[PDB]
Structure formats: structure tokens, C-alpha cells
Amino acid sequence: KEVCYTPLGCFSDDKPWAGTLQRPLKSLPWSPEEVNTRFLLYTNKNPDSYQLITARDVATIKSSNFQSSRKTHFVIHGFRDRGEDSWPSDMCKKILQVETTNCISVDWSSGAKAEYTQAVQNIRIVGAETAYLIQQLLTELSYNPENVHIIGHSLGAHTAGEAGRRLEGRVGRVTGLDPAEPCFQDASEEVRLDPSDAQFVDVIHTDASPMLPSLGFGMSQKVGHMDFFPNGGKQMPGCKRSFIDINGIWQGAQDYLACNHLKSFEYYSSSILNPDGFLAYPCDSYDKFQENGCFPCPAGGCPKMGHYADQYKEKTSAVEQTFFLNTGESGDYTSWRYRVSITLAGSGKANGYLKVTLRGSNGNSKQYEIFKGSLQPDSSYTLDVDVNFIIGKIQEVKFVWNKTVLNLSKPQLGASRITVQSGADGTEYKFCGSGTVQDNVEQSLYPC
Numbered sequence: 001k002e003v004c005y006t007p008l009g010c011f012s013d014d015k016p017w018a019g020t021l022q023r024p025l026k027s028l029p030w031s032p033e034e035v036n037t038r039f040l041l042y043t044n045k046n047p048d049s050y051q052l053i054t055a056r057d058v059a060t061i062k063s064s065n066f067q068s069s070r071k072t073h074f075v076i077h078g079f080r081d082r083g084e085d086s087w088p089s090d091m092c093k094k095i096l097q098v099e100t101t102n103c104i105s106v107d108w109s110s111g112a113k114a115e116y117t118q119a120v121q122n123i124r125i126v127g128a129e130t131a132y133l134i135q136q137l138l139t140e141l142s143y144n145p146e147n148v149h150i151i152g153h154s155l156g157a158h159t160a161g162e163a164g165r166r167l168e169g170r171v172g173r174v175t176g177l178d179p180a181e182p183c184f185q186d187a188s189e190e191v192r193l194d195p196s197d198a199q200f201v202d203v204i205h206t207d208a209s210p211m212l213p214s215l216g217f218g219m220s221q222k223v224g225h226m227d228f229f230p231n232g233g234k235q236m237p238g239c240k241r242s243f244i245d246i247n248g249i250w251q252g253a254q255d256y257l258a259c260n261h262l263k264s265f266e267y268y269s270s271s272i273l274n275p276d277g278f279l280a281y282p283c284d285s286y287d288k289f290q291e292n293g294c295f296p297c298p299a300g301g302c303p304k305m306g307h308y309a310d311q312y313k314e315k316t317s318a319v320e321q322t323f324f325l326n327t328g329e330s331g332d333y334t335s336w337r338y339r340v341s342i343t344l345a346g347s348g349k350a351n352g353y354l355k356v357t358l359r360g361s362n363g364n365s366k367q368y369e370i371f372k373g374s375l376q377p378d379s380s381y382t383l384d385v386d387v388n389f390i391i392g393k394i395q396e397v398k399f400v401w402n403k404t405v406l407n408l409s410k411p412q413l414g415a416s417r418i419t420v421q422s423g424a425d426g427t428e429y430k431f432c433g434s435g436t437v438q439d440n441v442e443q444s445l446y447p448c
């Protein structure tokens with residue numbers, strides 16, 4: 001029970017578009033007009049106001065600052081979001097401070113203001129609007145599709161994968177910023193987003209808890225050549241866990257219930273200006289990562305999660321290549337990972353915290369509990385940690401340690417050695433603290 005439209009063609013309401021386990025009711029997309037898809041063009045020439053372009057009137061493009069010479073970034077929002085002044089436009093601007101390029105924000109606000117179930121269908125339209133606009137950068141200005149990068153959030157991610165599929169995977173890259181779960185997880189690839197929709201698909205997963213009984217709006221399913229899982233991808237730091245601004249029904253609700261879903265475009269937008277800020281590490285599971293595994297960055301380097309992911313040598317050597325890492329709690333959310341070993345010393349057996357600080361070069365870190373437990377002489381005790389900022393080179397630690405069981409002597413403990421290390425490369429820095437002062441000191445171990 002299909003319906004056709006302008007140059008965009010037809011939309012069959014039957015499987016897998018509807019009457020799926022994933023999409024139980026049968027509906028059809030709105031009209032192009034009803035959706036009001038709008039391509040807004042930013043280029044280094046005009047980094048503030050945009051140029052309304054249209055694939056319907058080629059004149060609007062040719063007479064615009066669009067540069068057939070350069071890459072083109074598309075940024076598509078999702079359910080109940082907008083292009084005009086929300087984050088997508090904000091994101092285009094950031095992209096133009098670092099590369100000379102065309103960045104378009106795909107605003108379909110009015111169509112994404114529908115009821116989720118409908119919205120899940122309007123997405124098909126915007127796919128086509130977009131795909132179509134690309135089919136006419138090729139025909140009109142011989143603009144190679146493999147120069148196009150589509151970046152979509154939530155429903156937008158699937159939107160982008162849609163356009164991508166309309167162009168037989170000719171499009172060079174689509175990036176999925178926490179692709180929506182409801183109606184997509186475990187569905188035909190025809191309807192969702194999968195590695196086949198572009199030459200390169202990379203995904204950031206920030207809200208991959210189960211949508212049902214549980215409300216994790218993000219897909220847990222791997223759908224890219226690369227699927228990144230910041231902080232394990234289920235609970236992002238800075239957020240406390242779990243549309244018409246619910247904030248007018250229940251004050252705080254929106255933010256509360258969407259914060260993790262949104263960290264996907266947060267992290268990405270910051271990677272644009274901070275490439276070295278989000279290095280993913282390959283691993284089987286986040287726990288292996290969290291339990292001091294898969295460290296440090298591998299042979300060639302860690303992929304940069306985010307904007308500069310397309311620089312990874314083996315970016316498409318496989319599908320569902322998964323990586324893990326930890327972001328910051330706020331600001332630009334950049335964290336760097338270091339390994340920290342401590343082998344014990346002394347005579348008497350104690351119990352306690354095993355804190356640490358860092359001076360590096362740039363600033364100084366925070367306290368860093370590397371261990372709590374039994375402190376038997378000359379053993380060893382490592383733990384990987386996350387430095388929410390860019391320091392430099394260690395060789396300037398501090399130590400400190402506190403009590404858990406109160407007495408059995410009060411021994412002269414210290415720390416024989418403290419193997420430091422970077423994640424990026426492998427730069428150890430390790431130190432000798434010959435002089436095992438008892439308790440609660442800033443015994444500054446130093447180079448050797």
C-alpha cells in the first residue's frame with residue numbers, strides 16, 4: 001500500500017518498512033512538503049549564515065559557495081531535534097575551523113516533530129531528499145560520491161544509512177552517532193544502518209542499555225566497520241541514568257532521560273577539535289578493558305574516535321571491529337589513558353588506599369587510588385587510569401596512603417618501584433623511591 005513522491009520515488013508500506021516485529025503497525029511516510037527537509041550550506045567562505053540550497057533548483061547550488069574541489073560533511077539530526085541552530089549547525093562550524101570544506105546541516109525538524117512511529121518513517125523521505133541532492137552533485141558537477149561524509153545522530157544515523165543505501169554504498173563515509181534502537185535493532189539492513197551503506201561506517205554507542213524494560217535509546221548492535229563504546233557505551237559520565245520539552249510536564253525529565261543518548265554527538269563534536277582526545281583501544285569486552293587489558297595503543301596506533309576515525313589503516317579490514325575507551329565527565333570530555341604499577345616494599349603487613357598524583361608538565365592531576373587491600377612486602381599492584389586532561393610527561397609523581405585496619409605494628413612501607421606508562425605510545429617513566437618512609441607522606445619517587 002505504497003505512495004509516490006516528486007523525484008524521490010516510492011515507499012512501500014510493506015515489510016521490512018512496516019509489519020515487522022520491529023515496526024508492528026503499518027504506516028507510511030509523510031510528504032516531502034509535510035517534513036520540510038532543508039539543506040543548509042556552510043563553507044569556509046560563509047561560516048555563520050547558511051545558504052539554502054535545493055536539489056530541486058540546481059541554480060541554488062551552482063550559485064552557492066559549495067566547492068566541488070572539497071569533501072562534503074552532512075550532519076543529520078533525529079527525533080524531535082532541529083538543524084537550524086541546534087548542535088548540527090554548531091558542528092558544521094567546528095568542522096570548518098580545521099579543514100577547508102563543505103558542511104551541510106540537514107534540518108527536518110517539522111518531520112521529526114511527529115510521533116516516533118511516524119518519524120521512523122519520515123526518515124525514509126529525508127534519506128531520499130539527501131540521497132537525491134547527492135545524485136545531483138554527481139550528475140551536475142561530477143562530484144564524486146566517495147567525497148561525501150554523512151554524520152547522523154539517533155534517528156539521523158539511520159537516515160544517513162538510508163541515503164547511503166540509495167547510492168549503492170558509493171558514499172565514502174557515514175558516521176552513526178548513537179543510532180536509535182526502537183524499530184531498528186535486529187531489523188533488515190534495508191531499514192537500518194549497517195556497514196554496507198557506505199565505503200566506511202563508524203559508530204559511537206553512548207546509550208546502548210536495552211530500550212525495553214529499561215530505556216536505552218541506543219543500539220547495542222554493532223553496525224559499522226568500527227563500533228566504538230565510550231565508557232562501555234551504556235552509562236556515560238556526567239549523566240545520571242534513566243519531547244515537546246517534557247520539562248513542561250516534569251521539570252528535568254528531558255535532560256535526565258536523553259543525556260547519554262546525546263553524549264554521542266558531544267564526544268564527536270569535541271573530537272573534531274581534539275582528535276587526540278578519544279583514542280579507542282581494541283578489545284573483546286569493556287570489562288577486559290576496565291580490568292587493565294588491551295593496553296597500550298596497538299602496533300600502528302589507536303584509532304582516533306570521532307572525526308579522525310577515517311585515518312585508521314585497518315578502518316575497513318573488518319566489520320563490527322570494536323573498541324573501548326573512557327571519556328571525561330565534562331567540557332571537551334578528553335581523557336588520556338595511562339598505566340600505573342606499584343610494587344610494594346618494607347617489613348610489616350598493613351591495609352589501605354594507595355593514592356598518587358601527577359605534575360607532568362602542563363598541570364597536575366587528581367588523587368588516584370591505585371589499590372586498596374593487603375600490602376605485603378615486594379609484590380606488585382597495577383591499575384589503568386584516565387587523565388581528564390593533557391599533561392605531558394610524568395617523572396613527577398606524589399604517592400600518599402591511608403589506613404583500613406588500624407594496627408599490627410605501623411611498618412616502614414614505601415614503594416620500591418612505580419612503573420608509569422602512556423597509552424598512545426608506550427613511554428614508561430618508572431621510578432625508584434629508595435627511602436621507604438612509613439605512612440601518609442608525599443614520598444616523591446623519581447627517574448631511573
Ligand SMILES: CCCCCCCCCC[N+](C)(C)[O-]
Nearest residue numbers: 079080081154180181217258
Ligand atoms: C529514539 C528516540 C530518541 C529520543 C531522544 C529525544 C532527544 C531530544 C532531542 C534533544 N534536543 C531537542 C535538546 O536536541
Ligand SMILES: CCCCCCCCCC[N+](C)(C)[O-]
Nearest residue numbers: 246250251252253254256257
Ligand atoms: C531528580 C532530578 C533529575 C530529574 C529526574 C526526572 C525523572 C522523571 C522521569 C520522566 N518521566 C516522564 C518518566 O517522568
Ligand SMILES: [Ca+2]
Nearest residue numbers: 189192193194
Ligand atoms: Ca542499511
Ligand SMILES: [Ca+2]
Nearest residue numbers: 307308310311
Ligand atoms: Ca577526516
